[PDB]
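Practice problem. Given the sequence and the SMILES for manganese (II) ion, write out the predicted structure.
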Amino acid sequence: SMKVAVLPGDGIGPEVTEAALKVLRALDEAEGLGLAYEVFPFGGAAIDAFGEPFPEPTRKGVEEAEAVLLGSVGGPKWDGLPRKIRPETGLLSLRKSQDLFANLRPAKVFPGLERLSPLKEEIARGVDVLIVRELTGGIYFGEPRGMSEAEAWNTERYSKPEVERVARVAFEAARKRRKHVVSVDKANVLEVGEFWRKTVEEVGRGYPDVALEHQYVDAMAMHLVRSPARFDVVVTGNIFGDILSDLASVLPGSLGLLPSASLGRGTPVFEPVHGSAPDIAGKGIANPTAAILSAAMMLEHAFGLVELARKVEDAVAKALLETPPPDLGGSAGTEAFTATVLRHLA
Amino acid sequence: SMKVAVLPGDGIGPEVTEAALKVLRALDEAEGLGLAYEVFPFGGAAIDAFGEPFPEPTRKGVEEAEAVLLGSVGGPKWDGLPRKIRPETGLLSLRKSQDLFANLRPAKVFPGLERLSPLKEEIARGVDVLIVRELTGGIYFGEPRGMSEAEAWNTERYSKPEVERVARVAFEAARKRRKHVVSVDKANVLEVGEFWRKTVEEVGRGYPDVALEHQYVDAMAMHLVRSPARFDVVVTGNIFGDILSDLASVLPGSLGLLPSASLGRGTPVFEPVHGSAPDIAGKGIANPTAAILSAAMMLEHAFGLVELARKVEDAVAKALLETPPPDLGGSAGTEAFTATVLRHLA
Ligand SMILES: CC(C)[C@H](C(=O)O)[C@@H](O)C(=O)O
Ligand SMILES: CC(C)[C@H](C(=O)O)[C@@H](O)C(=O)O
Ligand SMILES: [Mn+2]
Ligand SMILES: [Mn+2]
Ligand SMILES: [Mn+2]
Ligand SMILES: [Mn+2]
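Answer key:
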């Protein structure tokens, strides 16, 4: 079996999700995967239908599935909503309800595609970095939090077990990759950074076969641009991971390329890093690469189909070289780009 | 006249600071500026002699001077000491005591040097962005803050007057440049971001001639790499400013290229945005560009010597294209490079 909860969301979310659905359907037919999917409302669409971005039928659908394929959420239609029901809060609520504390974001420059990077070729070449981002803690969820007319406040905080568990995922991922972890904090300025580093260092003792290095977040942003090829796994807290993963997104040359996996205690979630791009929704141009590669991450991580995930990745890489979408200077529409991916899969 | 407190600091700090002083003496000679300056112990140097990084006599000198020319602080010798008594903390104390809420970091790619940028030439051409970072509030100084065996916490908080005063600096700076400001927050997840955005918006109304735009911090990190050329002034909080300013610093191709001004209630501070670079200390190769441009910002912001700051800057620019330092593919040591700047200043 292969039970998938599909949450298309808003803007280009449904378009890119349908592209990823075509890739999955074509694999189901060829490999006999027994895929069964069901579509649920989430985000702006759920707010308009149920009054909340992560409504009951959707929460039930997620908990009962083996994996979630997620689109994108948000748009100006919902600007000004009380924070508790913003599309963005529904997203945090999804991550939190399944306690998906480990967010995996791979930034990779495919061999031959250095041209597309905004960086000079020799710097972009061989880039293959995995950002492990702590997703259900830190300032995103910390209390106290609030605002009055005179001030506003949010609390960046971590407990020992929260740091331990995300650190352990980073070490396990590194062990399967190039056995190198860079942990990122602001320990020269903050107590939380200090605490972060101390705990990651302790977890590191359990993995003496993996090299551990620490970097300050400001210096890390800089390294991700000057020498990204020297990184294997990067582990950091919620907001630092949010920032650095968008920054890494530029290495391949575009934001519509980065897929992601959210793993923890409950139903794993797979979503393209990009937002809902309201400006281009329904215009048949959104690059579906991120969504497709997220479906690839789902195959590997949720279903253990490593070989299949790589076929998709290989097909996408050829499609990018052959007929790139407009965001990479090409003229291939969402539909045509997906068809290209399909031919290579054959 | 011109009363300056000089804080060389640790590592390359004294060398690069000395280089900047040679530029300053040259101008005091050629222009008769009435330059009076005294050297004070700061950072690790202050720790060795007084047992603290920011002792009473250095505090006194700072407060009696009209401007501070600071080198850099930190080094392996002082690792191990509690964070609270680090040279880096003495730097935070200096900033806090003079309530220098506005940190100006101009990341610029001088015409002809696009080649040194990690970015492709067309992207790096004409880059001229000023980061206005709030420097005395936010998480860096937020109460409550702490650590136990079980967890640690820090508080990202801003008051209305704190956001208003840094925002104003941003608008005034823009008004002198290209009339565009981008304010940067994480309003979609953080109450403090919503509060920041709302306050910058109200201040913005007093500047109907300046264009105002808001970007999320993760998207902004991306834009500083894909299209830095579209930005003029960028204003943001303490930690977001720390990250984006290091990011912007990579654009012209080195560390050694970025100066900064710290402006506020007390004595203004001018320092190069780079660490003590412990390894190359006393070897005479460190790029003094950032220290020299920092004294140039001093001339402008502390003494209103616009024209002179500019002559210093054009001189440095031609020195870079004529005799580049080791850190930018060249072989011009600290003193030889300074002499080139001296030669162009006449
Ligand atoms: C939409 C926003 C809340 C979200 C986040 O900050 O996690 C997005 O930026 C991302 O990175 O998935
Ligand atoms: C050394 C450190 C405390 C300092 C900061 O974080 O402000 C430095 O990174 C900077 O950007 O000037
Ligand atoms: Mn993000
Ligand atoms: Mn003259
Ligand atoms: Mn910094
Ligand atoms: Mn005072």
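Check your answer against the key. Residues 1-346 of chain A form a domain with the Isopropylmalate Dehydrogenase fold (CATH 3.40.718.10).
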